[PDB]
């Protein structure tokens, strides 16, 4: 790629070739065309999965849910031409997006009839049937997570960041817990680094050592960050990270902070989060050895809206770790209130 | 305004200050904060309008519709704190957005109670009432267009093009037919020119004479294009524009094309349009005198989808004027079918 860049604070410009990593968070609510394999091959895969007892699909990200919403109508118009009594039903996502134990099979013969080329202009809509193949939603009672397929697609080509371009996907033959590397961008330049994908933007900086600076998550995935796209992967502990390894946190020294361990019990039920090292309004944290031990993350306001003023912790470094969500602040697992009992506060019930 | 631009065609990087006109089309589906006068002042204005015989609102553009969507909840929460038995209901726009004869009054007292500062975090939502103040739905039976207010606001401060900026509006004291000039940009450089706003992108080019090149419309407004934001407004007759004046067409020699008159009866019912001078697929146009006169715009495909092959115009110039919509092509009023009778085709039922 050829590009030009500018920084207005210093009034400098620069042009040339190289590798450019952009902030492409929330690049799913834009207009894109999606082509999941072929209309007939994908119908055959869904039919075979249904015959094999896989009830539905648990999504990996918001992008897969958007793709299923895009292709649902055509996938139902086909698979009715073939006499298959099956209907795809697509709902909304909830965080965190839990891992599923199954995978979609790769079909070998492909459904007959049907048509090619996702995006047929005119077709007759299909009638609803009695058997439903549920993509994510509030449907864990009708089929549990144990019978759901997860992480079955691989991106071949995309034009993310340019609207009205096509995304090409395929049903993978292998089995893996790894996130898709086709949309991951990592860079380091001097004393600043980024680990990014379509839903994460994780920043680190060079202080006395390298440390986490801030993170912006619009989703909580459960895939694993590939080591080929990770900086400084050697000689690291999986219990010294900040974002847990099971929440797609990179296994890097850029995902560490002195005095903090992995946040297994953070507020991972939110729609989107911001990880910051800064005190919340009206609160003050003190380092004292007589404070309590680690536990679930706590909200800085009570259920009635009262702000708790004094917090403690044993071996922190300041500023304290905090999560910014829609309903307010949450503190790290190491930070506990001084005088207020822990039973009087809103806590987190999610474990990674 | 300091800015740098690049032309990737050959190589042209340039920096400096000046006036920059950006392509801001579809700036309503982005995230912005909307601030009408004040919750109490706007509630007082709505109450006075309701007591004075104004039933509802016909919006000028999409942006006003989105603003009403944003402020509906707080406007209903206030105005029951003042005991007023009224409820605001917002619908979806339909094209074209017809002009309304009334305006919103400017109140001198401002409702008491309530609160300041649009954007209160927590409040009790208001219960529904019997009286409805409707904004652009399928509601012309419960009150007609003759009792609706139209073009009542004025933009005072905005940051369109940068997400999460605030837009500040105001109820106007006067009576006008002009579109809001705060979001209009016009520019000419060498042999190319632009007339643009939040819903219009109109291009003209220097041929042997200045002429219209192409236009992209996402809404069909009925306000008037101001002359302070128009190029070459003198010695121009309203009968020879392309986009009609009553559809917010600029009064410019840049809004003209040889052999064509004003398109009063085009397909103005469409959600989104593109205006191009190019033959549609499977059709050819021949200039000859024995062809018919002007009439309503005609679709190039019949109801069953058959493409009409051959067309004629009396005195038009190639390439022919055409409209591109979601349902297919339309020809200009000057282009008629050579052999197929005109009663067998789909036509436009809207007059500007």
């Amino acid at each position, epitope marked *: 790629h050829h590009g030009c860049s500018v920084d207005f604070s210093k009034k400098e410009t620069r042009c040339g070739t190289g590798v450019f990593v952009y902030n492409d968070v929330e690049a799913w609510r834009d207009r894109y065309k999606y082509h999941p394999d072929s209309p007939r091959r994908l119908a055959a895969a869904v039919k075979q999965a249904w015959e094999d007892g896989i009830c539905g699909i648990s999504s990996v990200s918001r992008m897969e849910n958007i793709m299923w919403r895009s292709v649902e109508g055509e996938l139902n118009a086909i698979l009715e031409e073939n006499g298959v009594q099956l209907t795809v039903v697509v709902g909304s996502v909830k965080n965190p997006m839990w891992r599923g134990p199954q995978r979609l099979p790769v079909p070998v013969n492909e459904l007959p009839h049907g048509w090619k080329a996702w995006g047929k202009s005119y077709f007759v809509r299909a009638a609803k049937t009695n058997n439903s193949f549920v993509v994510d939603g*509030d449907t864990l*009672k009708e089929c549990p997570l144990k019978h759901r397929a997860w992480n079955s697609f691989l991106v071949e080509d995309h034009g993310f960041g340019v609207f009205h371009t096509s995304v090409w996907l395929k049903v993978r033959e292998d089995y893996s817990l790894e996130c898709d590397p086709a949309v991951i961008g990592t860079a380091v330049k001097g004393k600043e680094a980024v680990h990014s994908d379509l839903g994460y933007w994780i920043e680190s900086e060079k202080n006395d050592t390298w440390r986490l600076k801030r993170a912006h998550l619009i989703e909580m995935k459960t895939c694993e960050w590939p080591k080929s796209h990770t900086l400084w992967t050697d000689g690291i502990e999986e219990s010294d990270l900040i974002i847990p390894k099971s929440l797609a946190g990179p296994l890097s020294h850029h995902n560490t902070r002195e005095g903090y361990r992995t946040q297994m019990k953070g507020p991972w*039920h939110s729609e989107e989060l911001e990880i910051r090292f800064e005190e919340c309004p009206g609160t003050k944290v003190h380092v004292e050895e007589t404070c309590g031990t680690r536990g679930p993350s706590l909200r800085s*306001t*009570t*259920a*009635s*809206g*009262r702000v708790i003023e004094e917090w403690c912790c044993r071996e922190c470094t300041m500023p304290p770790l905090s999560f910014r969500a*829609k*309903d*307010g602040c949450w503190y790290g697992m190491e930070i506990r209130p001084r005088k207020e009992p822990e*039973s*009087n506060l*809103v*806590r*987190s*019930m*999610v474990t990674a | 305004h300091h800015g740098c631009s690049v032309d990737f065609s050959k190589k042209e990087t340039r920096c400096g200050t000046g006036v920059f006109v950006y392509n801001d089309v579809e700036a309503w589906r982005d995230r912005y904060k909307y601030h009408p006068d004040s919750p109490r002042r706007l509630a007082a204005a709505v109450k006075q309008a309701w007591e004075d015989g104004i039933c509802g609102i016909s919006s000028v553009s999409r942006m006003e519709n989105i603003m009403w969507r944003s402020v509906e909840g707080e406007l209903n*929460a206030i105005l*029951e*704190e003042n005991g007023v038995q009224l409820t605001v209901v917002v619908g979806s726009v339909k094209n074209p957005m017809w002009r309304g004869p009334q305006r919103l009054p400017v109140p001198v007292n401002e409702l008491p109670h309530g609160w300041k500062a649009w954007g209160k*975090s*927590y409040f*009790v*939502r*208001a*219960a*529904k009432t019997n009286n409805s103040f409707v904004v652009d739905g399928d509601t012309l039976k419960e009150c007609p267009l003759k009792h609706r207010a139209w073009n009542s606001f004025l933009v005072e401060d905005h940051g369109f093009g940068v997400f999460h900026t605030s837009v500040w509006l105001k109820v106007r004291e006067d009576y006008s037919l002009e579109c809001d000039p705060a979001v209009i940009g016009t520019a000419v450089k060498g042999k190319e020119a632009v007339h643009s706003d939040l819903g219009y992108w109109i291009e003209s080019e220097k041929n042997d004479t200045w002429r219209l090149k192409r236009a992209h419309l996402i809404e069909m407004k009925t306000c008037e294009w101001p002359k302070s934001h128009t190029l070459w407004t003198d010695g121009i007759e309203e009968s020879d524009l392309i986009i009609p004046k009553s559809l917010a067409g600029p009064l410019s020699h840049h809004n003209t094309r040889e052999g064509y008159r004003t398109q009063m009866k085009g397909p103005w019912h469409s959600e989104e349009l593109e205006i191009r001078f190019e033959e549609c697929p499977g059709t050819k146009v021949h200039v000859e005198e024995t062809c018919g006169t002007r009439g309503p715009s005609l679709r190039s495909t019949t109801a069953s989808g058959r493409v009409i092959e051959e067309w004629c115009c009396r005195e038009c110039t190639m390439p022919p004027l055409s409209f591109r919509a979601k349902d297919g092509c339309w020809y200009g009023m000057e282009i008629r079918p050579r052999k197929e009778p005109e009663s067998n085709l789909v036509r436009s039922m809207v007059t500007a």
Partner: antibody
Amino acid sequence: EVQLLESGPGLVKPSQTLSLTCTVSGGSISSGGYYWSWIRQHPGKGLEWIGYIYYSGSTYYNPSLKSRVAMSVDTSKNQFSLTLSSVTAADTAVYYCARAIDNFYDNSIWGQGTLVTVS
Amino acid sequence: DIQMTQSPSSLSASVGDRVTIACRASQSITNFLNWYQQKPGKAPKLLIYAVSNLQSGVPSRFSGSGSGTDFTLTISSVRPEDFATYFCQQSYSPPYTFGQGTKVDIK
């Protein structure tokens, strides 16, 4: 425009389990800024607050009812319920369900109540 | 754990005069106090919240004031529909507690 309507058995024998259910109409029990509570009113006495529950899972229970209460949220039927074990004549009252706005105050709207007699 | 004390326990008034109810907290609750009204046979409904903020659809004759441990609820001009029982509730810290209630008889 939110209406609450709770039901349950009218009489319970002692030492068994009292089960109550509140059904929500005009709103969703999966919405963001709310939590759901229970309150009981003994005859010839004041009001007594039992506890709350969030849709995300966080709960609080009155320490007076020592390890005898439990609350759950049922999204499919759009309802939440209460369960009190080892009932006694002292557990006779009228039971109300309520929905409060979160982070604001205990600003609530209550149901119409159901009487439960233990004998 | 925070006891709420209400006085007087009951009172009678004529149509038009003024009525004063006092609630007392066993410890400093800043402004986390609510006032409830219960008609006979009906569930309580919230009249005032955060001490002074009145609800929508509430007659303006109701008012409240106070801070800390002492609070007051006043009815400027009694009307016959104001026959009910009034409670004070604190939301400073869970569990939330209520006063014993005050009855108003029309005289």
